Amino acid sequence: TIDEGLYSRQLYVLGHEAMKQMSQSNVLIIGCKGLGVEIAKNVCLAGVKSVTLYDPQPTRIEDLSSQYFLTEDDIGVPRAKVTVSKLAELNQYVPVSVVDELSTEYLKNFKCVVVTETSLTKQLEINDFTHKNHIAYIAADSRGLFGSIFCDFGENFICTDTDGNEPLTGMIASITDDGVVTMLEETRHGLENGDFVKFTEVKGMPGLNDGTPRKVEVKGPYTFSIGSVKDLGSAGYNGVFTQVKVPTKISFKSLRESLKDPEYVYPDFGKMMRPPQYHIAFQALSAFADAHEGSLPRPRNDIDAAEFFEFCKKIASTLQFDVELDEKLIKEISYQARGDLVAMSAFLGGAVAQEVLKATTSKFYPLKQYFYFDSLESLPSSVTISEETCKPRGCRYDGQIAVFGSEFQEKIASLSTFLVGAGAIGCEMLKNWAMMGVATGESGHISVTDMDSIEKSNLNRQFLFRPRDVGKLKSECASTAVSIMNPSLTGKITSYQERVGPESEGIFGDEFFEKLSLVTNALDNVEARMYVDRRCVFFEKPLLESGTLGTKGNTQVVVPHLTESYGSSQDPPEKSFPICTLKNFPNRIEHTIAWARDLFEGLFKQPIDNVNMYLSSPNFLETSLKTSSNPREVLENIRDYLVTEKPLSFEECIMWARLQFDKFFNNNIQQLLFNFPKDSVTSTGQPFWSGPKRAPTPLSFDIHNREHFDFIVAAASLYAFNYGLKSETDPAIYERVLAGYNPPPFAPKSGIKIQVDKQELKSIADSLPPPSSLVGFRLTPAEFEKDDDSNHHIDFITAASNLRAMNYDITPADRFKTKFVAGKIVPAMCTSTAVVSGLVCLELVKLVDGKKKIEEYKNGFFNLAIGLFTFSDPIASPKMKVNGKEIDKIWDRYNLPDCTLQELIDYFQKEEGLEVTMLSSGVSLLYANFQPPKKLAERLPLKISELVEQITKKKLEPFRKHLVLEICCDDANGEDVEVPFICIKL
C-alpha cells in the first residue's frame, strides 16, 4: 500500500507500521511564516494523510526573511492561500488545503495540531480543548536567536519505541540454572538493567525458547542474569537472545497546568540556567503583544525592552517563580523579538516536524515538555548592533537585519561559497543561503557541485526537486529552484557536475579555491569529507561540515588557525565480515546477503567484463597473468562465457540457472560437509559445527518452492540480459525445460583447501577464440542498481541469500531488508536534514563575523528519536614550539616564491633562525648539507621548480601553480626540530 519507491530511505527509519498510521492522521498547522512552512514542508514530505493551513494574516515583506514560498508579488495576500499551492507540489499523496475559520469542534478532525505565531491566551484556549479531546498539541515559535517548543500528546500517550534502536541480539554460550547467561566468544550483549530478552535455540532448557520475556540484570559486558531457571533445566547451552522492546505510557501535562511547573528538555547542559529565564521571557513576549496590539518589541529598542522586562517581573511573581531574573539575557529576547532567521526555522521546524510524526505513530520518545533553545553565540560582534543598525529597511531581509544589522547584511551578500553536494543537506543548505541572501552582493557567488542525477527516492527529502526533474542533474535543478526562491541569485550561482576529489583538481584548483570565502559539505561518504578537509587546510579556508543518520545528526566547524580539522579525529571504522564467515560459515542473514551480492557480481559482472576486455585490450591475457589475483578464473570466464556456456535461447538460460542452483546450494555444501562432517569434533573434543558455525544442509531442487523458483527466474533473466536474449516469466516454460533436467553426477573430491598449475592455464588460453574472429562483439554486464525493481537484481540477491539461509537454517529476509543490506542504503529523512542545515548556518554567521574565540563556535550532535541535543566547543589545533615561536601544527606553512635553493636556505637562516639541513619533494631528496660540494655548486643557483624538474627528471605539469616541500633543520641551538611545510607559489 505504501509507495516504497518514494519512501524507501524514510521507511528504513520509521517502518511500515508507523507510516501506515501516518497515512490516517490529518494535521493542522497554524501560522504560515518561516517556522510553519518548514513544519508543513517536512510533514508533507513525511507522508501524513493531509495538511490544513490557517494563516489569514496578509503577507508582509519581512516575512520573506525565512518563508521561502512567498514572493514579493504576494504581498498583501494571506499567507496560507499563497503557500498551499507550493506545499501541494511536494508530495502527491498529501493533499493540502486552507481553512479561513477556526472552530473548536473543527479541531476534532486532526490527530495533531501545530500552533505557531499565536498568543499564549489563544494557545491555552486551544490546548484546553485538545487536551480534553485526545488531540496532540505542539506549539513552537522562532524569535531571533531564541526558540521554544512545547508538546502535549495527552496524559495517556503510549510510546511503543522509546529510542528507535533495533532490538539487541547475540549468540549465547551457556546458561546456569540460577540464570547467568554468558555470551559467546567475548561478544558484548549491549543490554542495560531492566531490559527484556527472549530466547531461541537454547539447548538443555526447552521451556526457555517459548518467547516469554525475562527482565535482565547486567553482570558485565559479556554476562547478564535472568533469574532462576531451575524449574526448566540444569544447564543451558548455545542459543540466541533477542531484546524485547517494552512500551511506556507518557503522561503529558496541559499547557495551563505545566505553565507553573514546566518540565524542561535541556539542549545544552552548559546553559542549564537559561530555560527557566526563557520560560518567563516567551510569556512576557505574548503579554507585550496583547498590550501593543499584537506587536512585538522593536529591534534592539531599549524602551520596549524595559517594558518587556517589567512583564517578566509580573509573570515571575504571578507564577511564583523563585528565580533571580537575568536582565541582560531576558532583554536580549526583546531586542531580537522581531528576528526571523531561516536557520532557526530549519532547526525548530525539523524538530517540530519529527514531534508531529511521534504523535501520529507512537514511535520515538517525544519532547517532555518544554524545549527552550538559543544560539546567542551567533550574535555578531564585529559590527555595531543598535536600534539604528537593526531597523527595518523595507526588504526581504528585514527579519534577519533585525538581529544582525544592515552592515552585517552586506557581509553575507558578498560571500563566495562552495557547496559540495546537492542532495538532502545540499537542498536545505541552498534554501537557507537564499533566504539569508548569501552571495547576492557585487562580489558574492555560489558554486555547487554534484555528479549525481535526481531519482524517485530522492524526492522524499530533497525538496528542491520534483517528479518531473527525475533524471536531471541535482546541481542544476537546485540552482534553478533557488533562483525562484530568491531572484537576486539569478546568475550568481555556477553549478558543476564534478566529483570532488583528486581527479577534479583542474577545475577546483588553486585559482578556484583562492576566491572562496568558505566551503560547506553536503556529502554522504567519509572519503569525500576527508578530501575536502585536506583541501581546506591547504588553502586555509573555513569548512562547515554536517552529517545525518536516520534521526541522528551532527555538525562540525573548522576555523583556520583556530581549530583542528575534520580529519584530526578518528571515527569507528566501517564493519567488514571475515572472509571465512561469508565463504563457508554464515550465521546471520547479513552474511548471506553479502555472499549473494558477490555471487551476483561473479555471475553477471566480472566474467562479462573479462570477455569485453579480452576482445578490446590487445595484450589483456599477458597483463592479466601478471596482475590478476586469479588468472585461472579470468581464462575460464572467457572460455565459459564465449563458447562452452554461451546460450542461444532463453530455454538454455533456464538450464544454466538450474545448474547454478546445485553449484551454489548443494554441490558446494556437500564438499563442505565432506571436509567438515556434521559430527566432526575439534582438537578439544567439542563439535566442530557449534557456536558461530551452523551445520549446513544441501538443497534438492523443487520447482514448487518459491525460493527455488525465484532464483531460477532471476538468474535466467540476468543471464539472458548478459547476452541480449529476451527473458520470459510464464512458469510453463520453466516447468517445460526444468522437468527434463538430467543433473551431471557430483562427488566431493579430496585435498581441497577450505579455510576456517602452469601448463593447463597456458593450454586453455590457446583454446580461446581469437579476438580477430569477434570484431565488434561485446557482452552487456549487469551494473548493480538497487532502486530498479524490474532488473531482477534484488530478486536474485534476495532469492540467492534466502537459499543459502536455507542451507544454514537462517531466517530468510524479504526484498525490503535485502535491498537495505545489499544496497548499503543509509536511512534518512527530511527532519534530521533540516535540523543540521539550521545548526550549520548558525555557525556560518560566526565565520563571516570573523570570531576569533574558539568558545564562541559549537559542534552539534543530536538524536531526534530520544529528544537529545548536545553541543561542545571545537577542539583547538595542536600547537608546537620552534625557537620559542608558537607553530600551529595544522595550519601554519612557509610561503615562498620560486626562488633559488640558496635563497631558500638563506631565508630560513636569517628570517626564521633555522639551518636547513635537508629539503625534499615527495619521495625525492632535493638538497642536503652533506651532499658533495660539486652536487651543491650546480644546484644552489637553480630555482626550486628547476631543481625539482632536474632531480625528478620530469617537467612540471603546465597548470601547476604551487609546490609543496618539507625540510629538516636545526633550530638556533643546533638541535633538530620539526617545522611546517613549504608552499612554493609558482
Partner: protein, 76 residues
Amino acid sequence: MQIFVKTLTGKTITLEVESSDTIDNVKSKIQDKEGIPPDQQRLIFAGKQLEDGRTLSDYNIQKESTLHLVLRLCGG
C-alpha cells in the same frame, strides 16, 4: 564517586571515578564496558569536549555529573 555517560543512541553507562582521575582513565573504563577505543570516544560535559591529559576536576565534573558520548555521522 559516580558519574553517568549518556550515548547518542540513548544508552546510559555508570562509572566509578574520582575527581583526580584523568580523561584517559575515564576512557579506559568506557572501553572496558563498551569496547569503544579511547581515540574514538567523544565525551562532552557542560558544553566542553573532554581532552586527553586533563582531569575530571579540570572540567568541574563532580558527583553524579552526566557526560554525553557522541559520534559523527556520514549521511547527507
